[PDB]
Design a protein around this ligand. Sequence first.
Ligand SMILES: Cc1cccc(C(=O)N[C@@H](C)C2CC2)n1
Ligand SMILES: Cc1cccc(C(=O)N[C@H](C)C2CC2)n1
Length: 480
Amino acid sequence: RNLRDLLAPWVPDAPSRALREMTLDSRVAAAGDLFVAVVGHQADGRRYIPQAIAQGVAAIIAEAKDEATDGEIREMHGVPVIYLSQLNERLSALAGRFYHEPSDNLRLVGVTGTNGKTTTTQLLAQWSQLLGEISAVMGTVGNGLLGKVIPGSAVDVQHELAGLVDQGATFCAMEVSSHGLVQHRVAALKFAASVFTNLSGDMEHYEAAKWLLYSEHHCGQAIINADDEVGRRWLAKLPDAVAVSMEDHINPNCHGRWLKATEVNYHDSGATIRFSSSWGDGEIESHLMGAFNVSNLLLALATLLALGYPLADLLKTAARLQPVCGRMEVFTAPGKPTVVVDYAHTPDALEKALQAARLHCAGKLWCVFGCGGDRDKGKRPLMGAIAEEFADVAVVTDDNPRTEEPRAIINDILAGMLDAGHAKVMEGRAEAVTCAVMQAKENDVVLVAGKGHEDYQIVGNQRLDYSDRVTVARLLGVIA
Ligand SMILES: Cc1cccc(C(=O)N[C@@H](C)C2CC2)n1
Ligand SMILES: Cc1cccc(C(=O)N[C@H](C)C2CC2)n1
């Protein structure tokens, strides 16, 4: 890395100077670094140019606003300071060049929308890796090669993508937040494909702002959920986008690319999804639960088809796709009730989890759950009302009671019910889980909510070793 090569597209006359790393933080700007001095909300990095210089940086790139002209080269204490107008907008491009254009050196797929980003990215990364890629993810659960995901500016994004390319990644599925997009955090990334899952006067400016952003990015193949009203607006203006539906929203008159689920059977271990597409038809056995996960899987399928992965190979590998651990994670065993472990710990999340589970439930739906002690109490009766409404059997138990009296938490939950006497209460959590699993019938479904993959139960100030997954697995005679 050299300042002159780095800046060649923009600043013809920039001095040669070897560079080490790129940083926005004057506090970690080491000797040989490029410090980038950006102006944000209540922050002016140019204030810290003296400090960085004093810490021995090789060079500085700085916001030109009010201070200089675009491309102006100055020199302070023998250190080149190059000024650029609209530096926030350009930071992604600058960092891209610094880090050798990582998005041109793997297949990058970006997933945007309110929900489903995490699951859809995971599915993209898993399925592509099943077809021979070395895949990675960047998103809410962290960054890394699959299995090694470790728990944010335009520089950081490019740096992390370069790290992945360095570790041998050939495919990356990235969550792209609305906030990230607006703050130019992905501005110079070359997306192979861009996926839209869903959106949760005004409508004209919102739309306008997002269209403007779209027009400025390298989105690649566009893959859009046609079951969402906003998705259909995108599709109306993008004739080469791929429309995906599990209802009747594909308009066959447009002769565009499409994928639609024609029949879905939600069963005790997943969903059987029959589909047609402009690539051919097929049937997939998904091991994920609920309708929204059928949509997420279809989006991943359509994306991979769009990118040229063969339908036959995707079909042969689909049954290996797994849920994110502790997210609507299904446990079945021959002749036992189906048990779903989900992290749902809010009224809305609990409601969605119950509605998803219900689709797969021939019998009674059980819900085992509690609420955290020494935290806001407001959700407690709301979760009680939800469990009573959307399950057939509510089993109220403990969930990280901490220092709060466990039964007091349970009381708050029960207080939200129309008919609390119809709820079952069982303390200890392990005991409650066991109660549901051992009493439920073979065609029942038991949702164990609140913990997902979090393998502890906080009682007092002790983190006790405890896993919903392991509890369930042992009861069913399976392996967590
Ligand atoms: C770009 C494309 C490809 C295939 C089908 C379609 C499609 O059904 N569009 C619908 C949802 C129109 C109202 C927006 N659009
Ligand atoms: C991943 C990504 C990056 C940059 C822009 C975009 C974008 O405007 N996406 C739209 C929602 C398009 C329907 C797919 N998506």
